[PDB]
């Protein structure tokens, strides 16, 4: 390994400014126009929350409906068009766009690029997201209202007899939208990941989050065309009178296999990156590295590939399935998704653990996800699932893994980053604060539907006889539910506040041990990301940036065998 | 380049293991719980999935057999190695945005079915993504 | 030699080396430039052909 | 040409999953890796065909499934361990020949 | 499972509320759901105590106040320990599969006698139930009774092909209602009566389902089962049947929908009524001796409550709902 | 050496969109499948597969097979640094593919003037909707063949204008496989 040689007058380079200075009229024409991985990554972010407050409104009102028995304020139609569209706007205008601005803001740095392979495609798949949740939400402008059917939009109840309203071809129309801007993101994501990395970083000395985004983008690239397609015939039945979605041509299961294939598959690409979040976050705030880092990419990898057989297991009771060709290959995609816990308790395994905001926001995605997965492989029998289909236990499980992932995760990877964003801190108290609230919130919600479902509640009930005995239940879990309602007012007030006010970050890393590249660079960081790159020599380079004398420990402690690597003699013929 | 083609072929030979597992056996194996009878969605669509990836592998890897060592590849690789120029790299561009709108006229319009509306939207699209692709090639002014 | 046109803006070439671009193949990391690669910046404000104004108005 | 072995002084340790006597860059590994994987399937077809003829069902061609089952399991197996050992076969003389196991 | 859970208060928490089964493949369904929540349970004890153990012990204050010092033991791999926990999940899941194609394949057979069926008719948004067949031993006058009722049906089977000329589905009208069964004694649920479908107990027992429309669900809490209602179930590749070999307790129980269908989804109930063997019988000879007989009729006819007890129609005043009062006492 | 040889940009995210494809097609695929074995479990399919007309479309075929080729050797001069050629034949590729559109256009008028719609029966959906949404791909490829005409109008021709021109010949190659994929599903599997 070369030394350079030391010059005269050195001077480090110029930090630029952290956020809330910005001067009037600095960003209105810059957001229209901006070509950045990490504007266009901060706006994905901030779009996909402000959509998560607008769907967890439907769901609160749902939450209120069923507090008692009756239809206290709400209708039918109105409940039907909720419980559908808190589905649609909490999948594909929160979890997916979030999921690709993380990608975007935090990818390149830590591969070590400028820019993203494609940026105008970037923009285009940022502009193109946000016209689809338009498209979705503009239902609810006509009269009739938004669509009915729930957001898997099963048939015949889609067709042009069962629903004649133009809401429901709104609702594809947008769904077809978000998918684009999914596809657009995915190629950019690839692409950047295979030409332009740092010199010295091969694949395999990528972070963990990286390898997550790569898997996932091969199958938002497989997927998202399908739902594009079926989508596409619904729409030529419904407006060109078409024939191909009609029971007599079998076309309920064919419309469910479709719709299935891509949809399994979107629920593993919202899980894996956050997988990835937390795979970043946890080696940080516990000293270590992450443990069985190869072999976490094997199981990533794994998790890839098993995605596409497993579709059907959510047609167990349709009558029509191969039941134990799927029931068996849930059982095995549910076994990779497993070897992550075993990692990150090894990563914690006698670490030196310091509890910041983020690390208690990535042990409640632990623990709520391990109920979630638990939950899940008893949904994979079938004979539990002719009983718990459609039930309120699977509404407990599907919440129980999106609100681990796409919300808990997601809140850990804004606390995380929140200084290569802004060079700014966030407000530790509030953080706890709705850390908490969120923790109570969830818990004391979803926790008892588990028995509300089991007892015999179907999901997308909008009314119930007091006789069933669910009240009791509804109750509480409503009352929880405003509870979690409230978390997000600390979290906003701590993002708006901080971005702002907060205090200011003075150097490249404030956790301190910062292990993936974009510690090894500003907060925030200049137009194209790097003033300047260190040598990259493992799979954490700020780490060894941070800290030479523990390269030598970092090495030699990596494997539990003697294997006698020091003792090796020169290998190079010569150093030329 | 090099490593992540090979990774390309676990998923093909799973998809494709999977995809002839499925057909014979939806066309073979009894049940009293369900039909029986060659399932073709889920045929088609995974023997086009293991489709995708054998395309995306097979040219990833005919690519690497002809690049060089770069540096990026290269575990022991000195960052002054990668001097030189980069690339171009948009700076900035309204066409995004225009072909976003534009999208959403024709979608729109299609929801509605006005034919003027999926026309226009078509006429949008279409001009809006020449102008991205014609953005640095508009000849100097000239009288 | 004839047997192909070459255009103008084609850059200097050794046809030892295989083509300057191929489907597969490029010589930049990332996309290749619209002004060519055998131009090179910054020039002189001179060939730059800006003439920069000068505006006065009245008060 | 093809490329020599990096040079290491005594006394350095690499880490270096993707070096070029590294079988991960190999492909030889990765289909034996998809193979392994392919492995399971046919130890699904056995555990159900035995477990549908164990309640009275399937009985008329419980045999054919499990025999496939197992010679499936079985061949995927023998050609998933000789993929991998022939792409490991580089690393295995590089070890031979020299002091690193990394 | 065979084996049943274990007793008192622990098999109450594990099976966490689920009914108790009236019908002998509901029983092995909530033993095999016990026995795996046992397992779940354990598995996740371990999990959550190693996350409190995170917690409680291996803090970084705990390290730097008994001298551990700044960074600890940087130990990345254990590659047997990485092979032990990627089998053991392996093997423990299938040992899960084999039991679950066990229990599976007890639920899902036909390897039964059914000595009554029931042909159940779905549509938007009530049930029609409708006794299809009868054995001997059971239906009235001793014979064996076939329930179809020819010219209602023979009225469907022509629908298959529109005399108009149209006909585009694979040659048959879009409104083809050919799949449809109409038995002789039905049970039109409506609005305002909640259909009772009266079954015998310890007897085999067939459903045949099918939809008029869209695509509905026939769930019985107390089955512990349910199966989705698809119009056209031969083309939609649905096995259309299912079979219980009896049915265990005499009583009332409820069954509700499952499947979003629309808008008064949640409105589509009935009530599954079982009847010692020979008052089926007796009911079953009333209503063949009285085509004009209403169901409730034939209820008080065998002793029985005239309507439903498990459930009750809805309000359907979209006002008076709001204030609680949402049944309309139809008994 | 004067610089390393390394993967054209470009194509890579070119190849990375024409995945999109491949499994836009699959759901296509599906909707014709399930429908010809539901056609077929009626023995009613060849009812309206006695509308077509495979020597037509065979040379439909023809046509688009050539242009297939013609884009190819338009590559070829591209990467020559030869202007004149690209121009040349990507407009009788240009050409040759306004001439299948056109036909397939004639095709259906065809079928549609005696009797063939989308409505008449599920054949003639899955028909229209299979062969309609490969015939938009193909005007969207004549587009983009002018675009890059237009493009070698206005700009300089420089390497990155002829990388530009190699994948929307990537493009119209994937088109015309699709068309084969199409064609021996449509007219001869039936
Ligand atoms: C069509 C649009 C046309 C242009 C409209 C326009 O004038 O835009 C600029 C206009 C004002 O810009 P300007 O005054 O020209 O520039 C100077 C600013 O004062 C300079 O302002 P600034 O850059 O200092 O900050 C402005 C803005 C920065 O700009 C934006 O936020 C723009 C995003 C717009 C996309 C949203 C689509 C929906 O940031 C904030 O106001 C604070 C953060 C806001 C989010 C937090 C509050 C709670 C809601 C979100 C939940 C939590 C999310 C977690 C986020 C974590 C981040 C790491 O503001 C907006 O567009 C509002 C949105
Ligand atoms: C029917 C569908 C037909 C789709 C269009 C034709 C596809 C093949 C085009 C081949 C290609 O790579 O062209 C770009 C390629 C880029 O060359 P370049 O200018 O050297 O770009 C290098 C820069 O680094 C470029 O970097 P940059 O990121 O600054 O520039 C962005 C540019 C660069 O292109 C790329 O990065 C190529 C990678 C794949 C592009 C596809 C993007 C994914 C779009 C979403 C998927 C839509 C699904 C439907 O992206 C595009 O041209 C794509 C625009 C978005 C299209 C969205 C249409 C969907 C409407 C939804 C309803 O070649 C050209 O620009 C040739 C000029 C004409 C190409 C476009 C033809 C438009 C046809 C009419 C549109 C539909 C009617
Ligand atoms: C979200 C949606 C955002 C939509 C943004 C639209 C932007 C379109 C291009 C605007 C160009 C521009 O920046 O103008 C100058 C100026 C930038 O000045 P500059 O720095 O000198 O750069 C000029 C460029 O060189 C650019 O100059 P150029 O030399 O390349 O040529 C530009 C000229 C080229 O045109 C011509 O020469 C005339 C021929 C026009 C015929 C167009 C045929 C189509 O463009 C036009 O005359 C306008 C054509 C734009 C067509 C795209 C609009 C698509 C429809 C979107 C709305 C539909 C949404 C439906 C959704 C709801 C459902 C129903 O920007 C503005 O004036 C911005 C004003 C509007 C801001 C929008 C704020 C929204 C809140
Ligand atoms: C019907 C009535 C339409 C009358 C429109 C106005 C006619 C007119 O003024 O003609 C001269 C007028 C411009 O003549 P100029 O003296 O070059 O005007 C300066 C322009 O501002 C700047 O024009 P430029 O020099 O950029 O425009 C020429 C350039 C760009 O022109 C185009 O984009 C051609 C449009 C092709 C239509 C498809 O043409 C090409 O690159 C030709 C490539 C091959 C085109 C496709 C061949 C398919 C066979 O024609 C055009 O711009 C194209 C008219 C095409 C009509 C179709
Ligand atoms: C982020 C989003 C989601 C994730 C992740 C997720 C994970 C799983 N799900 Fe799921 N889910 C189902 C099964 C699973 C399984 C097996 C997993 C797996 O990822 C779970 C495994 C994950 C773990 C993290 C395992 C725990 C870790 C360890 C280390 C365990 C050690 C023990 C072992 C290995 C042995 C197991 C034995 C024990 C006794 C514990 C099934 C059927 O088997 C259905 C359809 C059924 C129906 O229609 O009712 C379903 C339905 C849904 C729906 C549809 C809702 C709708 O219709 O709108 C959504 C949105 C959803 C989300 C998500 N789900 N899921
Ligand atoms: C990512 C995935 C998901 C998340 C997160 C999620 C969160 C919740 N869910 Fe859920 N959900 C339910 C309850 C909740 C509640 C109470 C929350 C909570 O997290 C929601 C509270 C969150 C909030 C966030 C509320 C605060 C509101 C604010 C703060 C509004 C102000 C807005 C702004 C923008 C202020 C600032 C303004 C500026 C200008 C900056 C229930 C039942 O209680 C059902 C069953 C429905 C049924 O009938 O079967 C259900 C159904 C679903 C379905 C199936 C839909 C279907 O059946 O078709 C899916 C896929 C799903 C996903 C997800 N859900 N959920
Ligand atoms: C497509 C998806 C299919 C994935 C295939 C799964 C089976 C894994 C087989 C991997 C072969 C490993 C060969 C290799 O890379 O050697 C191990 C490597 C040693 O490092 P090094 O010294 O650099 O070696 C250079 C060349 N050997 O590194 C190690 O020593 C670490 C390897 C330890 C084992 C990895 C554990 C991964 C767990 C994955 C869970 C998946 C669960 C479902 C499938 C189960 C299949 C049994
Ligand atoms: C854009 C809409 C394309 C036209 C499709 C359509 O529904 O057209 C109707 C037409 C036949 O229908 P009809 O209304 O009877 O008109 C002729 C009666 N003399 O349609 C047909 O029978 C011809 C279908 C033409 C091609 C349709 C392409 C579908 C593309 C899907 C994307
Ligand atoms: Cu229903
Ligand atoms: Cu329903
Ligand atoms: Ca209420
Ligand atoms: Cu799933
Ligand atoms: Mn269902």
Same mark, same amino acid.
């Given at each position: 390994t070369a030394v350079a040689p030391r010059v005269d007058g050195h001077v480090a380079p110029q930090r630029p400014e952290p956020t809330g200075h910005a001067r009037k009229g600095s960003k209105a024409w810059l957001m229209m126009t901006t070509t950045d991985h990490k504007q266009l990554g901060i706006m994905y972010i901030i779009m996909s929350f402000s959509f998560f407050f607008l769907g967890g409104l439907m769901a609160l009102l749902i939450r209120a409906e069923l507090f008692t028995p009756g239809l206290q304020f709400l209708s039918n139609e109105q409940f039907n068009q909720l419980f559908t569209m808190h589905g649609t706007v909490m999948l594909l205008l929160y979890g997916t766009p979030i999921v690709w601005g993380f990608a975007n803001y935090v990818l390149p740095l830590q591969i070590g690029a400028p820019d993203v392979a494609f940026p105008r495609l970037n923009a285009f798949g940022f502009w193109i997201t946000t016209v689809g949740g338009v498209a979705m939400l503009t239902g609810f402008l006509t009269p009739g209202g938004a669509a009915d059917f729930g957001w898997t939009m099963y048939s015949p109840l889609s067709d042009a007899i069962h629903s004649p309203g133009l809401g429901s071809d709104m609702w594809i129309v947008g769904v077809g939208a978000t998918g684009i801007g999914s596809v657009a993101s995915a190629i950019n994501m690839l692409t950047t990941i295979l030409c332009l990395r740092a010199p010295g970083m091969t694949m395999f000395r990528m972070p963990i989050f990286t390898w997550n985004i790569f898997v996932v983008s091969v199958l938002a690239l497989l997927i998202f065309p399908l739902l594009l397609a079926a989508a596409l015939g619904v729409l030529y039945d419904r407006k060109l009178g078409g024939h191909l979605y009609d029971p007599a041509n079998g076309g309920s299961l064919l419309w469910q296999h479709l719709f299935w294939f891509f949809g399994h598959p979107e629920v593993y690409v919202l899980a894996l990156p956050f997988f990835g979040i937390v795979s970043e976050i946890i080696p940080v705030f516990s000293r270590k590295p992450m443990f069985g880092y190869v072999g976490l990419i094997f199981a990533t990898l794994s998790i890839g590939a098993l995605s596409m057989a497993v579709w059907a297991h959510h047609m167990f009771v349709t009558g029509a399935v191969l039941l134990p060709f799927f029931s068996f290959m849930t059982f095995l995609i549910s076994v990779p998704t497993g070897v992550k816990f075993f990692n990150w308790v090894g990563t914690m395994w006698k670490g030196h653990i310091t509890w910041e905001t983020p690390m208690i926001w990535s042990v409640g995605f632990m623990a709520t996800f391990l109920f979630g997965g638990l939950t899940g492989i008893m949904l994979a029998s079938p004979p539990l699932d002719f009983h718990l289909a459609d039930s309120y236990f699977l509404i407990a499980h599907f919440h129980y893994t999106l609100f681990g992932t796409v919300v808990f995760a997601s809140c850990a990877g804004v606390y995380f980053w929140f200084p290569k964003m802004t060079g700014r801190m966030m407000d530790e108290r509030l953080g706890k604060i709705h850390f908490w609230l969120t923790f109570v919130g969830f818990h004391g919600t979803f926790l008892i539907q588990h028995w509300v479902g089991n007892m015999g509640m179907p999901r997308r009930y909008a009314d119930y006889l007091d006789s069933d005995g669910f009240t009791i239940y509804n109750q509480i879990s409503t009352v929880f539910s405003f509870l979690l309602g409230l978390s997000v007012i600390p979290f906003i007030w701590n993002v708006f506040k901080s971005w702002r006010y907060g205090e200011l970050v003075t150097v490249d890393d404030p956790w301190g041990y910062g292990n993936s590249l974009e510690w090894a660079t500003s907060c925030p960081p200049p137009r194209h990301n790097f003033a300047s790159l260190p040598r990259i020599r493992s799979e954490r380079p700020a780490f060894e940036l941070h800290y030479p004398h523990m390269i030598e420990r970092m090495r030699a402690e990596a494997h539990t065998g003697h294997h006698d690597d020091i003792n090796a003699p020169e290998l190079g013929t010569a150093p030329a | 380049m090099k490593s992540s083609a090979k990774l390309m072929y676990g998923p093909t030979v799973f998809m494709a293991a999977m995809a002839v597992i499925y057909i014979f056996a939806t066309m073979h194996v009894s049940d009293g719980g369900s039909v029986k009878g060659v399932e073709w969605v889920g045929? !088609?669509?995974?023997?086009?999935? +293991?489709?995708? $990836?054998?395309? @995306?592998? !097979?040219?990833?890897?005919?690519?690497? !057999?002809? /690049? %060089?060592?770069?540096? *990026? %590849?290269? *575990? *022991? &690789?000195?960052? +002054? %190695? #990668? &001097?030189? $120029?980069?690339?171009?790299?948009?700076?900035?561009?309204?066409?995004? +945005?225009?072909?976003?709108?534009? /999208?959403?006229?024709? &979608?729109?319009? !299609?929801?509605?079915?006005?034919?003027?509306?999926?026309?226009?939207? @078509?006429?949008? @699209?279409?001009?809006?993504? $020449? #102008? @991205?692709?014609?953005?640095?090639?508009?000849? #100097?002014? #000239?009288? | 030699e004839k047997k192909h046109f070459v255009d103008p803006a084609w850059p200097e070439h050794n046809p030892a080396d295989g083509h300057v671009v191929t489907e597969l193949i490029s010589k930049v990391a990332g996309a290749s430039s619209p002004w060519g690669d055998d131009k090179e910046f910054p020039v002189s404000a001179e060939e730059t052909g800006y003439v920069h104004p000068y505006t006065r108005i009245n008060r | 040409p093809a490329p020599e072995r990096m040079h290491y002084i005594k006394g350095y340790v690499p880490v270096a999953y993707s070096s070029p006597h590294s079988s991960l860059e190999r492909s030889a590994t990765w289909l034996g890796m998809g193979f392994l994987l392919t492995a399971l399937a046919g130890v699904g077809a056995v555990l159900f065909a035995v477990g549908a003829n164990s309640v009275g069902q399937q009985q008329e061609h419980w045999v054919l499934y499990s025999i496939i089952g197992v010679v499936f399991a079985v061949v995927c197996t023998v050609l998933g361990t000789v993929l991998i050992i022939k792409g490991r076969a580089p690393y295995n003389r590089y070890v031979k020949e020299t002091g690193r196991t990394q | 499972c065979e084996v049943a859970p274990p007793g008192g208060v622990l098999g109450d928490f594990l099976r966490m509320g689920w009914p108790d089964g009236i019908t002998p493949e509901a029983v092995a369904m909530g033993n095999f759901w016990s026995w795996v929540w046992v397992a779940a349970w354990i598995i996740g004890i371990i999990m959550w105590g190693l996350f409190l153990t995170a917690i409680f012990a291996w803090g970084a204050k705990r390290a730097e106040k008994r001298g551990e010092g700044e960074f600890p033991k940087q130990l990345q791999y254990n590659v047997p320990l990485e092979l032990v926990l990627t089998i053991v999940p392996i093997i423990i899941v299938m040992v899960l599969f084999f039991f679950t194609v066990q229990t599976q394949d007890k639920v899902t057979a036909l390897d039964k006698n059914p000595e009554v069926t029931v042909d159940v008719t779905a549509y938007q948004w009530n049930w029609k139930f409708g006794y299809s067949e009868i054995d001997g031993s059971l239906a009235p006058g001793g014979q064996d009774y076939q329930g179809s009722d020819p010219e209602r049906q023979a009225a469907a089977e022509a629908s298959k092909k529109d005399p108009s000329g149209d006909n585009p589905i694979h040659g048959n009208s879009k409104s083809d209602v050919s799949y449809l069964e109409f038995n002789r004694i039905e049970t039109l649920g409506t609005t305002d009566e909640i259909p009772v479908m009266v079954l015998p107990v310890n007897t085999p027992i067939e459903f045949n389902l099918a939809s008029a429309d869209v695509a509905h669900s026939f769930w019985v809490p107390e089955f512990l089962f349910k199966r989705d209602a698809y119009a056209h179930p031969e083309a939609n590749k649905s096995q259309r049947v299912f079979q219980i070999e009896e049915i265990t307790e005499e009583g009332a129980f409820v069954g509700r929908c499952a499947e979003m269908c629309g808008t008064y989804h949640a409105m589509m109930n009935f009530e599954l009524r079982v009847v010692d063997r020979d008052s089926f019988a007796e009911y079953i000879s009333f209503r063949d001796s009285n085509p004009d007989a209403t169901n409730a009729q034939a209820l008080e006819h065998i002793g029985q409550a005239p309507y439903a007890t498990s459930t009750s129609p809805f309000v359907s005043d979209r006002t008076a709902t709001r204030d609680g009062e949402n049944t309309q006492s139809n008994a | 050496v004067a610089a390393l040889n390394r993967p054209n940009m470009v194509s890579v995210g070119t190849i990375v969109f024409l995945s999109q494809e491949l499994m836009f097609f699959a759901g296509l695929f599906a909707m014709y499948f399930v429908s010809r074995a539901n056609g077929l479990a009626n023995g009613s399919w060849g009812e309206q597969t006695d509308h077509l007309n495979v020597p037509y479309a065979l040379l439909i075929t023809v046509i688009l097979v050539s242009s297939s080729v013609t884009c190819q050797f338009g590559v070829f001069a591209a990467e020559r640094g030869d202007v004149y050629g690209l121009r040349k034949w990507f407009l009788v590729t240009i050409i040759l593919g306004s001439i299948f559109v056109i036909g397939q256009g004639y095709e259906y008028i065809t079928l549609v003037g005696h009797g063939l719609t989308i409505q008449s029966s599920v054949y003639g959906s899955a028909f229209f909707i299979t062969t309609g949404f490969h015939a938009l791909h193909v005007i969207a490829g004549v587009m983009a063949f002018v675009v890059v005409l237009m493009r070698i109008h206005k700009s300089k021709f420089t390497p990155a204008q002829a990388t530009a021109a190699m994948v929307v010949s990537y493009y119209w190659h994937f088109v015309d496989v699709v068309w084969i994929g199409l064609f021996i599903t449509i007219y001869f599997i039936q």
């Open positions: - | 045929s !088609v669509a995974l023997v086009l999935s +293991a489709g995708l $990836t054998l395309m @995306l592998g !097979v040219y990833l890897h005919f690519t690497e !057999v002809r /690049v %060089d060592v770069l540096p *990026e %590849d290269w *575990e *022991e &690789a000195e960052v +002054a %190695d #990668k &001097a030189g $120029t980069l690339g171009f790299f948009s700076p900035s561009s309204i066409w995004p +945005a225009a072909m976003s709108g534009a /999208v959403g006229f024709l &979608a729109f319009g !299609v929801v509605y079915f006005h034919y003027w509306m999926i026309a226009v939207g @078509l006429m949008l @699209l279409i001009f809006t993504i $020449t #102008k @991205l692709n014609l953005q640095y090639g508009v000849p #100097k002014e #000239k009288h | - | - | - | -």
